[PDB]
Structure formats: C-alpha cells, structure tokens
Write a protein that binds this ligand. Structure first.
Ligand SMILES: C[N+](C)(C)NCCC(=O)O
Ligand SMILES: C[N+](C)(C)NCCC(=O)O
Ligand SMILES: O=C(O)CNC(=O)C(=O)O
Ligand SMILES: O=C(O)CNC(=O)C(=O)O
Ligand code: NI
Ligand code: NI
Ligand SMILES: [Zn+2]
Ligand SMILES: [Zn+2]
Lengths: 385, 385
C-alpha cells in the first residue's frame, strides 16, 4: 500500500534519527540506536529463534547513521564502525514510534477490549466438543473469555477429565498445591472451606499465592437439588462503582496490604503466606486484579491498630456492592456444563447445600496462566484470519 | 512466660478496643472488630482447614465488646448479638499490633535477611544427596538460597533427572513452554539463543512471562574445555550501586515499561508477550525483581521517540556495572554440579564455546516458584527447630 511504500528516507538530527516519508505523506521517525539494536543480520539476530544475539556491550548509545540509501521497499544503512544493516518498509511501518501506531500495535498484542457487566449479563455459551475440534470456536472461546471474563461450555461429559482436555487445548494447566485438577466435594477433615457444604461468599481463588491463577476452569460432574447455585460478579465493574460512591473505601482497599495464608496437605504438604492489596491497580490507577478470599485472609494483619476498623468498614462497603442485585449474576450449573473465567477480575461464589451419606455434588476444577491463554489466543487469531 | 501471661484485660475506647496488660507490664491493643472477625469457634472457623468460615456480611464493623472476663491464659468475650468467643493468651501475644511485634512476625513468615555480595562471593556449597536425605541439610539449602541468592550442590550424577529430584524435595517444579525440565545444548534450528554455542551476557530467565520463574535449577551433565564458564552477579547489589552513581539511569530503568517476546515451538507452540520495568521496585522504592534478557527484549518499544536513546544510555550504564570486576563472580561447572539460584535477583551468563560434531556441553535446567520454595522452607524450619 501507499502507506507502506517509502517515498524518502533520510538521516536527521545529527544522523541520530532516520525519518521516513511514506507515500501517503505521513512521516515516521526511528532512533539510530534502536535501528542498530534491531539489525536483522545473522551476526545480530538469530533467525531460528527470532531473537536478538546483539549484546548491550556492542551497542554504541551515541551512534548515528553513517550512510543511507533506499528504494520503495527497504532501507540500507552503513554504520560508523562499518557494520551494515537492511530494514524492510512494512517492518518499519508497523514499528512507527507515533502514539497512534504504538497504541494500535499494543491492542493487537494484548486484546484490551473489556466489556463490563452487571446482573444483565447474557452468559456467553459455546459447545465443548466444538471448542476442542474447531479453531473458529476455540478462538471465539478465548477472545470472549478475555473480553467478557467468562464463557460457559455446554455438552461436556459427566466424568472427570474434561477440564484437562481444555487445558491441553490451551497448552497446559497451572499446577498448585491442590493438584493438577481438584475435586470440589464435601470431604471429611476438609482442608479448605470449599470442600464442605457451606456457602462460599464472593472470592477470588488463591490470593494465598504471590501470583494467583489467572484463569479458572470448573466442570459440573454431579449437582444437587438442595442448593449449590453459582454466583458471579464483575470485580472491575464493582471497583469502578466503589471509587465513585466511596472514594475513601476505594483508597483504603487499593493501598492496604492484607496477609493471606493456607496451611495443610493435599498434592503435597504446604504452608503458604502472601501479601496483597485487595484492589490492585496499575501505575495509571486502573484496576488489574482483585485479590480476595475471606476464608484465607490471615488472622495476622500488619497494620497499626488505628487503621484496622477503617479497613473493615471499607471491606464491608466493597462486599455490599458485590452483593447488590444490580451487580451479581446467579445461575445453576448442570452436569456437562463447564465455566471458564478470569480469576483476576470476577469474584465467584456458591450457595450452601445439604450433606448426604454419599457425594451429592461434585465439580472438577483447574487453573491456567493468563500467559498460556494469551499465547494460544494469539496463535488461534492468526490461524483464523 | 511473664510476657505471655495476662495480668489484666479490659474493654476500652467505647468497648471498641481490648487492652491486655501482660505480666511484664507491657500493654497490647486489639480492635473489637478484629477479635470478632477472628473468633475461633466452630461457627466462625473451620478447624480442619485452619480457615475462616465467618463472612464479611456477618461482621458488624462498628461492633464493641459487650462483656469480658479473663484469667492468666485466656479471655472470654460476649458480643452484643450474644455470640461468644474465647482467645488464648499466647495467640494474642504473637498477634500484638505494636510495630515491634508485627515486624517480628513478618520476619518469621518471610525470611527477609539478605546478604549482598560482589566478586568476593564465597559460593555456598552443600552435598546433593545430603540435601535430598536430611532435613537439616535441606533447611540450610533453602535458607541460604533465600539469603545469599545461590547455593551450589556438588556430587549429583552425570545423568538427567537430578533437578527433578530437587523439585520433588521442594514440592514441584514450574512448567513452562520450554518443558518440565530443559536441555541447554547446541541445537539445529535453535529456538532460543541459549541452545547455541554463543556467549550469553547477563540475563534473568524468562522476562517474556508476566511472572518470571522465581528460582532456577541448573545441573551440569557434560562440560566442555573450550569455554562455557559461568558468570553471576547480585542484581540487588548492582541496582543499589546504580542508584548511587547514576540516579537518572536508575529512574529510567525503574519506571520504563519494556516489551519482551518469545515465539516458537518447544513443549507446545507459543507466541508470548509481556511488559516489565527492568528494575522493579516495591511501593517503598526497594528493588524486588530484575526483569532483563537482551535476547528476548522485543523490537517493539512502546515509548515516544525522545525517550528511546536515554533508555539505551541507562541500560548501558546498568550492564557496564554488572560487568565490573568488583561485581561479577565467575566459575566453572563440572559434571555433577548443580546451582540453584534466585532468578529474580541474580543475573547470570555464560562464555562462548566451540561447536562439535556431537554434543560437547549439556546442562539440564528447571524452574520453581518462590511460593513453593518458601512453603518448604517454613516446613523444614519447623521440623529442624
Ligand atoms: C478450590 N480450591 C483449589 C480449594 N481453592 C479455593 C480457593 C482458595 O483457597 O483461595
Ligand atoms: C533456558 N531457557 C528455558 C531456554 N530459557 C532462557 C531464558 C529466556 O528465554 O528468557
Ligand atoms: O462449589 C462451587 O460452586 C464453587 N467453588 C469454588 O469457588 C471453590 O472451590 O473455590
Ligand atoms: O549455558 C549456561 O551455562 C547458562 N544457560 C542459561 O543461562 C540459559 O540457558 O538461559
Ligand atoms: Ni472458588
Ligand atoms: Ni539463563
Ligand atoms: Zn547486524
Ligand atoms: Zn464464633
């Protein structure tokens, strides 16, 4: 295209910048040091790995272009030490340092589109076997998981092993002290409040870890009629409402380190401790993760005494908002259903049910790392486009 | 002890605080809301899980103590709604909200002691089989790993499978796209600069992931006489020197997001992207992780053009300090040697060596999560004390 065709290339700014004038009349600028650092020749770049061999030690940070020629599709550069580089037009164009170009590329890499939701949620639903068999369906699955935060898959079996198939479709699951996969059932000497018939209030899984699981997979093998309905809420949507309604409570929860703990025996013996802010913000003040399980929050609370009661007051306000009828979405899982969701963004819970002489309710769960998921999503997108 | 024996317990501050006067005359304060939240009774606390059943929804954040009695070893509290709680003296004492008590407990949980080192490093060394067989030795191993950042284990075999034994001793290894364990050897169509005979400059492993591996294990199966010596540097020590010598360069590297990438096929097919600050600080300005591999730093750099050359100038200053003869420690791995090190703190590298018609050099590596390691360290400490 005219946008990707070179009209003129020139060294500017004491030879420290290259400027490309494109055939659409737009101009791009490329620092000489960045071009040299990204030389694609075999000395500098290992093509089989698509990786940089060039060392920092080799890079003159004050380098300027010694000579430059070009045609419509490439630039050819000589360097002061006689090194020689070639750069393709389309490669340069994609990597333009303009804010618009950089932002476009970041969108393509990280899929930031987010659709916030309340009690009006239309639970995205796909077929399990279709997702396993067809790239178009697996793509819709992971893209929707990223954007909405949850997808339900229907028509799995009523036998263990289904979350493992989804894990292989992603790449691999995320092993924790509760196993490769884990069985949510009422257990004698339960090592986790999950493994009882009690109500689970809204929580994220595993804030006792530094790096809580990014994605959760939960498959219904057996369901009870006595209770055990599912509830979910969009934590990012809730945090937005909290900041607006109660900025003091938002400030406390986004700045206060809370200790989490887990001790017991499952896959192996464990004694786990972490610290997190319940509302975890990026450097720009945007919420990126919620870290909260009331069951594993430690008895240890490392704050001065005067900060304690205001913390709990803040926390109450947050949970009250999560529970509001405008925020929460309630549903019942049947055998064969699987939900896959963003464990950093949603909070989830379940209603109490009745104990029995044999197991009346059984879910099999597993976790996946967001990096594993995003990798597969990038591959799938390329395959489908 | 007199320190742990109750002399007086009293509700204060409108019944919103409990004060304990101990037999040493020291005073501790406990917020009423915190005591109620941490009731150990069977309604509030699941003993088999050592976890809180009590919901946020159940907690009156404005609660005060209705009645209190005590003896030397426990306090007995009635609440306004008629709930009833018992707290043991030793439990309360450990959880005193004084800064001194809180800081002591944080030390016991997280083992913060750090011993910075330069080229004078005396490489801590233990026997491999001793570490597998004896808790006293496994304790010294992990405690030293945490404090110094590296331990060498000698007397392993010259066969694959040794890092896997150490992984089981910790709990489990950290699976990545390069496998459960991985073979560092020269490979045709290498998917990583590591799998060549080239020099690796100082790097941390895997900044292409959001959560880079906490701990690295590297076992020498075959070594070459033609090169391939090992080099290490204490990144936390280096960052301290950089902040002192060049505060501008420190500021740039601790505030600038750098994109990292990895594309290829190994355990499965992958297309990985991340963003990190190379020098990653906590909320108090202390360095907690270094994220840097020059080979996987992307060609994509998401900064305005005017910030590019100063970034590279900063980076050069950092690498130059890492390479200084006062900072780096160089050694040669022989068959049977294993190093286990903090991949968030150290940077590591290796000298070039000569290609041959069969494999002349072979290391087997693996990763572990710091949470897995710290769990085992806590268990071991308890077993040994
Ligand atoms: C379901 N399992 C694996 C027990 N995790 C619950 C969540 C947690 O303990 O934070
Ligand atoms: C040794 N392996 C597993 C290839 N990793 C190298 C480090 C990296 O690619 O950042
Ligand atoms: O049992 C359910 O429906 C939900 N389970 C969980 O959220 C859990 O085990 O952490
Ligand atoms: O080969 C060596 O001695 C060191 N290897 C690495 O650091 C690597 O593979 O990332
Ligand atoms: Ni859960
Ligand atoms: Ni390495
Ligand atoms: Zn080159
Ligand atoms: Zn109670």
């Amino acid at each position: 295209s005219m946008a990707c065709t070179i009209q003129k290339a020139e060294a500017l700014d004491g030879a420290h910048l290259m400027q490309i004038l494109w055939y659409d009349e737009e101009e791009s600028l490329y620092p000489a040091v960045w071009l040299r650092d990204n030389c694609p020749c075999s000395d500098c770049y290992l093509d089989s790995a698509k990786a940089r061999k060039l060392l920092v030690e080799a890079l003159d940070v004050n380098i300027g272009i010694k000579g430059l020629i070009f045609d419509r599709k490439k630039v050819y550069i000589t360097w002061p030490d006689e090194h020689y580089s070639e750069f393709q037009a389309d490669w340069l164009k994609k990597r333009c340092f303009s804010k618009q170009a950089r932002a476009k590329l970041q969108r393509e890499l990280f899929f930031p589109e987010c659709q916030y939701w309340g009690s009006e949620l239309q639970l995205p639903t796909l077929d399990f076997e279709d997702v396993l068999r067809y790239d178009e369906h697996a793509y819709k699955w992971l893209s929707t998981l990223k954007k909405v935060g949850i997808v339900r898959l229907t028509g799995a079996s009523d036998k263990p092993g289904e979350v493992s198939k989804l894990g292989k479709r992603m790449g691999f699951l995320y092993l924790t002290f509760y196993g490769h996969t884990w069985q949510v059932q009422d257990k004698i000497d339960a090592n986790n409040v999950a493994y009882t018939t009690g109500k689970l209030s809204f929580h994220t899984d595993y804030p006792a870890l530094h790096h809580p699981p990014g994605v959760q997979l939960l498959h219904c093998i057996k369901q009870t009629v006595t209770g055990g309905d599912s509830e979910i809420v969009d934590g990012f949507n809730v945090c937005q409402k909290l900041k607006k309604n109660n900025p003091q409570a938002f400030q406390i929860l986004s700045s206060t380190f809370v200790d989490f703990t887990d001790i017991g025996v499952d896959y192996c013996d464990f004694s786990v401790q972490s610290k997190h802010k319940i509302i975890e913000l990026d450097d720009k003040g945007q919420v990126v993760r919620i870290n909260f399980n009331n069951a594993t929050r430690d008895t240890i609370f490392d704050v001065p005494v005067e900060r304690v009661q205001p913390f709990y007051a803040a926390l109450k306000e947050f949970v009250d908002l999560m529970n509001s009828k405008e925020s929460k979405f309630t549903f019942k899982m049947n055998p064969g259903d699987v939900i896959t969701f963003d464990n950093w963004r949603l909070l989830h819970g379940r209603r109490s049910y009745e104990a029995g002489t044999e197991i009346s309710r059984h879910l099999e769960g597993a976790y996946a790392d967001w990096d594993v998921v995003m990798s597969r999503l990038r591959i799938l997108r390329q395959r489908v486009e």
